[PDB]
Design a protein around this nucleic acid. Structure first.
Ligand SMILES: [Cl-]
Ligand SMILES: [Cl-]
Ligand SMILES: [Mg+2]
Ligand SMILES: [Mg+2]
Ligand SMILES: [Mg+2]
Ligand SMILES: [Mg+2]
Ligand code: NA
Length: 228
RNA sequence: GGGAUGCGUAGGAUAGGUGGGAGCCUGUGAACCCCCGCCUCCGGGUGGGGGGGAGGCGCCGGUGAAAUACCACCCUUCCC
């Protein structure tokens, strides 16, 4: 069969037609998290954009009220004194155009990459393909590039996450853990939704949030009302 | 509403996109063997049945632009 019996039991706990309020969803999440770890909770949205149009792309950040519920691993690529600054800002792995080969040799143990401007030429040319399409190439307007590297890293450690729509027009984020008490999950969800809406492209066709869902790392989904 | 389909090269080999994921599946019958339908890029994939009778898969590692389980929103091409 397509799923195991564990997953199949979860299918009886959700209505496929209902669009749930965010509070209902936040309360249901724990019933849909039956894997043997604390499952990340996710929000997904199909977006009223043409994704193949650069000017209707949706990229941005939000500081999650209660964060992801896990250690966030930041790779900072910097030069000279920015190396030390990155480090004292709690970045976990910090270096120069050196460690580009470390990423090119395929170490991908980071949840965010941030970089100073003076390294972005190398980062661009060498990690452009590996990180580009995924919106992971440090970028001045996902706020992952700057000389204020310490400031950028602190925001990330304090719960800031990035989102970028995919080439199909959907967008997705982790917004916490299913062990989060329901009001806290609901807090994170609303924050992500608010931020997603803050980057609605000027002039795109139709409703911006065509559909919105909450789901757990290995459970079924719950369609939600983003304005609840 | 259901189902199918997703293959440059390297790589176990058929890696659609992105996000999640450190575990997942398994007497609700694992590997492996065979039959049939469908699909096929001619490598195989996929669905069902039967045999078998207790493991297999993922992480890690390797290769790669991207990593396999598992889950989510989607997109491609079809079919009932
Ligand atoms: Cl700056
Ligand atoms: Cl919705
Ligand atoms: Mg995936
Ligand atoms: Mg990953
Ligand atoms: Mg499994
Ligand atoms: Mg038998
Ligand atoms: Na999921």
């Amino acid at each position: 069969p397509k799923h195991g019996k564990r997953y199949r039991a979860l299918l009886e706990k959700v209505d496929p037609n209902k669009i749930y309020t965010i509070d209902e969803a936040a309360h249901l999440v724990k019933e849909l998290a039956t894997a043997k770890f604390d499952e990340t909770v996710e929000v997904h949205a199909k977006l009223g954009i043409d994704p193949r149009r650069s000017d209707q792309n949706v990229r941005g950040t939000v500081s999650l009220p209660h964060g992801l519920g896990k250690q966030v691993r930041v790779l900072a690529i910097a030069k000279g004194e920015k190396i030390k600054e990155a480090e004292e800002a709690g970045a976990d792995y910090v270096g120069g155009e050196e460690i580009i080969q470390k990423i090119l040799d395929g170490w991908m143990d980071f949840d965010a990459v941030v970089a100073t401007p003076d390294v972005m030429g190398a980062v661009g040319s060498k990690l452009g393909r590996i990180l580009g399409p995924r919106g992971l190439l440090p970028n001045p307007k996902a706020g992952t590039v700057g000389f204020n590297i310490g400031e950028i890293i602190r925001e990330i450690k304090a719960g800031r996450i990035e989102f970028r729509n995919d080439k199909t027009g959907a967008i997705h984020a982790p917004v916490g853990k299913a062990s989060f008490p329901p009001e806290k999950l609901a807090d994170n969800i609303r924050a992500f939704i608010r931020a997603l809406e803050a980057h609605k492209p000027e002039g795109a066709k139709g409703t911006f949030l065509r559909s919105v869902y909450v789901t757990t790392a290995m459970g079924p989904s719950v369609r939600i009302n983003p304005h609840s």
